[PDB]
Amino acid sequence: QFTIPEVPKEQTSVYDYAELLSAAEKASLENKLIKYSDTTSTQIVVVIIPSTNGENINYLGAQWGEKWGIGQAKEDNGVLIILALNDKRIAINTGYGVEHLLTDAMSKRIIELDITPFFKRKDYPGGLDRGADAIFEVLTGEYQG
């Protein structure tokens, strides 16, 4: 099906396989995801790949989250943001533990209203950064949409 790579030695929470981020943007986003994950008792990760190679992005993200055990040390409170850069598609995959707040509707809303407007303005790193903030808002009962 999907070829998911190995879990790297350095699990920094941001995995950029599409050469998108500057080193400083990557380090800032890693810090943000780690702090949000800590305070919300979740495991939030960002994966950027060139393409899904024709596969469904939501099913790829689910396979990726399962393979890497995202949220396994946090009672299935995993959140995976997966961007297929060349495909211009993004998905948010959630473990069973956070799905009640971060529903498919809320994840779709974050993609539509929080992330995609940055991508339309040619600000892909900015869209990922706002996506992390919007996920934190949903997890903490502060989302306004």
Side-chain angles (χ1 to χ4, degrees), residues 1-7 59-65 67-68 82:
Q1 39 185 333
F2 318 97
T3 306
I4 316 295
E6 67 146 27
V7 177
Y59 278 81
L60 172 66
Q63 256 269 275
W64 201 303
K67 187 199 174 164
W68 283 22
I82 185 158

Side-chain angles (χ1 to χ4, degrees), residues 9 16 20 35 63-64 68 77-78 93 100 103 105 108 111-113 124-125:
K9 181 185 165 68
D16 186 359
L20 175 63
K35 292 288 155 63
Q63 256 269 275
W64 201 303
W68 283 22
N77 282 342
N93 290 282
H100 65 285
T103 64
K108 284 195 292 178
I111 293 165
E112 183 196 3
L113 309 181
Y124 280 69

Side-chain angles (χ1 to χ4, degrees), residues 29-55:
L29 183 63
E30 286 163 342
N31 171 66
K32 174 168 285 191
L33 299 175
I34 292 162
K35 292 288 155 63
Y36 289 170
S37 295
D38 182 39
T39 68
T40 63
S41 307
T42 62
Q43 186 187 356
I44 312 162
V45 166
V46 165
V47 163
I48 308 143
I49 57 176
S51 178
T52 66
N53 307 161
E55 296 299 338

Side-chain angles (χ1 to χ4, degrees), residues 23-143:
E25 281 165 349
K26 184 169 183 268
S28 293
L29 183 63
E30 286 163 342
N31 171 66
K32 174 168 285 191
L33 299 175
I34 292 162
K35 292 288 155 63
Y36 289 170
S37 295
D38 182 39
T39 68
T40 63
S41 307
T42 62
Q43 186 187 356
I44 312 162
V45 166
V46 165
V47 163
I48 308 143
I49 57 176
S51 178
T52 66
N53 307 161
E55 296 299 338
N56 183 102
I57 193 165
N58 303 101
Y59 278 81
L60 172 66
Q63 256 269 275
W64 201 303
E66 191 197 319
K67 187 199 174 164
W68 283 22
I70 302 174
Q72 288 308 302
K74 296 262 185 108
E75 312 183 324
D76 203 36
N77 282 342
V79 182
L80 173 57
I81 303 137
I82 185 158
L83 169 61
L85 182 62
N86 306 344
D87 298 359
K88 293 180 218 287
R89 284 269 290 274
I90 187 166
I92 300 168
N93 290 282
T94 60
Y96 188 81
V98 285
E99 184 266 305
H100 65 285
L101 280 182
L102 190 51
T103 64
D104 180 47
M106 300 314 286
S107 288
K108 284 195 292 178
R109 200 158 297 165
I110 287 171
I111 293 165
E112 183 196 3
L113 309 181
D114 299 291
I115 303 177
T116 301
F118 281 82
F119 289 180
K120 293 198 173 168
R121 297 191 304 260
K122 297 190 190 68
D123 185 8
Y124 280 69
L128 293 177
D129 174 72
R130 172 61 195 152
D133 292 345
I135 287 166
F136 177 75
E137 287 168 0
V138 165
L139 295 168
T140 60
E142 295 288 352
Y143 189 70

